Design a protein around this ligand. Structure first.
Ligand SMILES: Nc1nc(F)nc2c1ncn2[C@H]1C[C@H](O)[C@@H](CO)O1
Ligand SMILES: Nc1nc(F)nc2c1ncn2[C@H]1C[C@H](O)[C@@H](CO)O1
Ligand SMILES: Nc1nc(F)nc2c1ncn2[C@H]1C[C@H](O)[C@@H](CO)O1
Ligand SMILES: Nc1nc(F)nc2c1ncn2[C@H]1C[C@H](O)[C@@H](CO)O1
Lengths: 284, 285, 279
C-alpha cells in the first residue's frame, strides 16, 4: 500500500462537497461497457484528473471518469475506465475507488467486465452472472489487502465464500425471465489472470480444470476490497469470445479476430444492469 | 524479493545472541497462531524481545510484539519463536525467513514448525493435529520464493531439493509416540498448501486447492521450511485444524451460526504438549 | 519501468555499428548447451557490460557468426528470474534481436521430466507452455505497451511455430536416432528451489510434460514482436513423483552422460539451421 485512511477520507469528502448527488450504488464499467454512463439521468461528470488522490492515467486515451447520476431512479456513481494490473498499477491503486465509494456512503457495488468463455456451453454475446471467482494473483501474494489491516474498513481475514450476494443473483435470474431473451442468463466462475498476454491452449486447459467458467484480467481486486468494507456485490461478465481449448480447433481458426463486445451485446447488458436497479434493496 | 541482508548481517545477529545468552540451542521451534503458550513450558528460559535483537524485522506496533525465548523443553536446548512474520502483513519473504538463517548460525540443526490451518480434507475435524508430510508452495510457483536472488554457498546450493523436506525419521516417531500416548483421535497426516492471504478462500478456490491434493491450507510456514532445508536443517511440523473450509455452495447457505475461531485453547494445549514429548525423539548432534 | 523504445534502438544500433554481422536467427542456449558457440565461423564476441543498456550478468556474452550457413546471434549465459532479475531485463535482449533484424528465435533449456515416458537424455520439441508466474502478475509485457513492438493483448496459442516443428520431426527421422523426439508442454516455475513430490504431482495434473525456470518470458516477448519461435528441452532428470522411489537412491551421477546428450541437442540445432525459412 501507500494510501493513508485520511487520504481516502479526503477524496470522499471532496467529491461529496462538489456534487449534491449521494449514491447508494457504485457501478464499475468494463471494457466496451462505458455507454452505461449515457443511461444515467441528471448526470454530473468528474474526470479522474480532477478528483484529489485519484490515480493518474499513464494509458492511451482519455483519463476516464466518475459519473454521478440516477439510473432508473437510483442514486449511482459510475466508473468509466478501470485501472488494470497489466498496465502496471499496483492493486492498492486499482482498488482505491472502491474504498472511496464506501466512504461516499455506497452500500452496493455492481461489477461488469468482458471475458473469454472457458465453458463449452457459453457463446459469444452471452452474459454470465458471476457466482464466484478464482483469484490467481491472490494465491501468490497479489491481493489488495496486503499490508497492515485497517479496522475502520474491515477485518484482518475477511471471508469471500459469500462475495456474490445470494439475493441479487436470485433476482437477476428472475428479472431475466420477464425480459424474453433468446438465450438464458448464464452463471459461473470468473477466473482472474494478470495478463496482458492471452492464454495458450495448454493454459486454457488448466483454467478449465480449475473449474473456471470464464477468464479475464480484472474485477476480483475490487470485489475483494468491497467485501472487506461490507459492501453488497454482484456482477456480470460479457462473453466476448470463446477461448480455443484444443489444437485441433486452433488450426480451424479462419475468419477471426477476438473483437470487442458486439455493440448490441454490450447494450443488452447495459440495459439489464439498468433495469436491475429496481431490485437492489433500499438502504433504509 | 530484494534481499537487504548481507551474510555479515545474519552473522552479526547470530553472534550477538550468542554473546547475550549462554544457551546453545540444538532445536528451533516456530510457534503458530495460538500456540505461543509453548514458551511457558521451557525451563531455565531467557527472553529476547525482537526489538532488542539487531537486524530483526520491525513492525508498526500492533498488539502482539513478538519475541525469542531460549531454554530447555523436556530436557532439550531450544530457541523458540513466538510471533512469526507473515507475507500478508507486507513483509518480504526474506524478512519472514531471516530468523531461520540466524538459527542455523546459532548452531541449530533441527527446525520444528507449528501452525493453525483450515481443513481441506473431509476426514479432518476441528481440533485435529496434522503431521505435515509435504507442502505445495503456490507463491513460489510465481516468483515469491525466499531463495530468490543470488545464492550464498555458505548457506546452501543454488537449487536445493524439497522432495524430502519433512524428515522421514521424525514422521515415523511422531506417529509412534502418538500411538503409545493413547489418544482418542488418530494423528492425521497430509499436505499443507500455502496461500498468500490475507483474504480467505472462496468455495471455487477451496475446490482447486482440494484438486491440487492439499489437505490443509494456511498463510505461512512454507517459506521457513524452504530456507531451513537450504541450510540442511532437519524439519518437521504440525498444523492444528482450526476450522473446516466450506467446499460447496450447498453448505455455504447452511453456514449460518458461525465464524472461523482461533485454536480452541484445549486442542492447542494438546499440540503444545505433543511437541514437548517429541523432543525426546529428535536425534542428538 | 526499465527500458524505453529509444534504449532498445540505441543498443540495436550500437551493435549494428560495432559489427559487420547482420543476423537472421537468434539462439538463446540454456544451461550446459553453449558449446554451440564454438561452431560459429567469423565469430564476433561482445561481453554484456560492453553493450549500452544491457543487464550486467551478476559470465555472460553475445556472439555473432555463421552457423551452418546462417547469420546468427548467440546468447551464452541467459538471465533467470530466480537470480533476482526482473522479467523486463530477462527479456531485454529479445527485442534488441528484433531491432537487429532477427526474424527467428530458437530457445533451448534444461528441464525436469514430468511425463513418465521421458528418460534422461531425451530431447523435447516444445509444443506449448504454461506460464505459471504469468498467471500471478510476473509477465514481461506488464506495464506500458509500444505498438512498434506489438499488440497490447498478444495471442500465444501458436507461440511455437507449426512449420519448424514439422521440420524438426522430419530431420529427426532423417538423423536415424534410436530414441524418438519427444514433444509436449513446458511449464515455467520460478525457482530456484526444486519441486516437492506434492508440487510435481500438481504440475503433472496441470498437463505439463517438462518443468524448468526459464524460456517462457523470452518466447512471449519474441511472439509479441512477431519473431518465429521454436525450441527444445533437454530432459536432465526424471522428477520424483512419489515417495516409494524417493527412498530408492542410486549410482548417482546425473552429469556426464549429459555431455553426449547435450551435444546431441547442440548438433540438432545446427542441422536445423538449414530448415529455417529465409526472409
Ligand atoms: N481469453 C481471454 N483472456 C483474458 F484475460 N481476457 C479476454 C479473453 N478473451 C477476451 N478477453 C477480454 C476481456 C477483457 O475485457 C480484455 C482484457 O482486458 O480482453
Ligand atoms: N480456510 C483458511 N484459509 C487460510 F488461509 N487460513 C485459515 C483458514 N482457516 C483457518 N485459517 C487459519 C490459518 C492461520 O492460523 C490463521 C490466519 O492465516 O487462520
Ligand atoms: N564473410 C561472409 N560474408 C557473407 F555475406 N556471408 C558469409 C560470410 N561468411 C560466411 N557466410 C555465410 C552466410 C551466408 O548466408 C552464406 C552464403 O550464402 O554463407
Ligand atoms: N526437476 C527440475 N525442476 C525444475 F524446476 N527445474 C529443473 C529440474 N531439473 C532440471 N531443471 C532445470 C532448471 C534449472 O534452471 C536448470 C539447472 O541447470 O535445470
Amino acid at each position: 500500500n501507500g494510501y493513508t485512511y485520511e487520504d481516502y477520507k479526503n477524496t470522499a469528502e471532496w467529491l461529496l462537497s462538489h456534487t449534491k448527488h449521494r449514491p447508494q450504488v457504485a457501478i464499475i464499467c468494463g471494457s466496451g461497457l462505458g455507454g452505461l454512463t449515457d443511461k444515467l439521468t441528471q448526470a454530473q461528470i468528474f474526470d479522474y484528473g480532477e478528483i484529489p488522490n485519484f490515480p493518474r492515467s499513464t494509458v492511451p486515451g482519455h483519463a476516464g471518469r466518475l459519473v454521478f447520476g440516477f439510473l432508473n431512479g437510483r442514486a449511482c456513481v459510475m466508473m468509466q475506465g478501470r485501472f488494470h494490473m497489466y498496465e502496471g498499477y499496483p492493486l492498492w491503486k486499482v482498488t482505491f475507488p472502491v474504498r472511496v465509494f464506501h466512504l461516499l456512503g455506497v452500500d452496493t457495488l455492481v461489477v461488469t467486465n468482458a471475458a473469454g468463455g472457458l465453458n463449452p456451453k457459453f457463446e459469444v454475446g452471452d452474459i454470465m452472472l458471476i457466482r464466484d471467482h478464482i483469484n490467481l494473483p491472490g494465491f501468490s501474494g497479489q491481493n489488495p489487502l496486503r499490508g497492515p489491516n485497517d479496522e475502520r474498513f474491515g477485518d484482518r481475514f475477511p471471508a469471500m465464500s459469500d462475495a456474490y450476494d445470494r439475493t441479487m443473483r436470485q433476482r437477476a435470474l428472475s428479472t431475466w425471465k420477464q425480459m424474453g431473451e433468446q438465450r438464458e442468463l448464464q452463471e459461473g466462475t470468473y477466473v482472474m489472470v494478470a495478463g496482458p498476454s492471452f492464454q495458450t491452449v495448454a493454459e486454457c486447459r488448466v483454467l478449465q480444470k480449475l473449474g473456471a467458467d470464464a477468464v479475464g484480467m480484472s474485477t476480483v481486486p475490487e470485489v475483494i476490497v468491497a467485501r472487506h468494507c461490507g459492501l453488497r456485490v454482484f456482477g456480470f461478465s460479457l462473453i466476448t469470445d470463446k477461448v480455443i481449448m484444443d489444437y485441433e480447433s486452433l488450426e480451424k481458426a479462419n475468419h477471426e479476430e477476438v473483437l470487442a463486445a458486439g455493440k448490441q451485446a454490450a447494450q443488452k447488458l447495459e440495459q439489464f444492469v439498468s433495469i436491475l436497479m429496481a431490485s437492489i434493496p433500499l438502504p433504509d
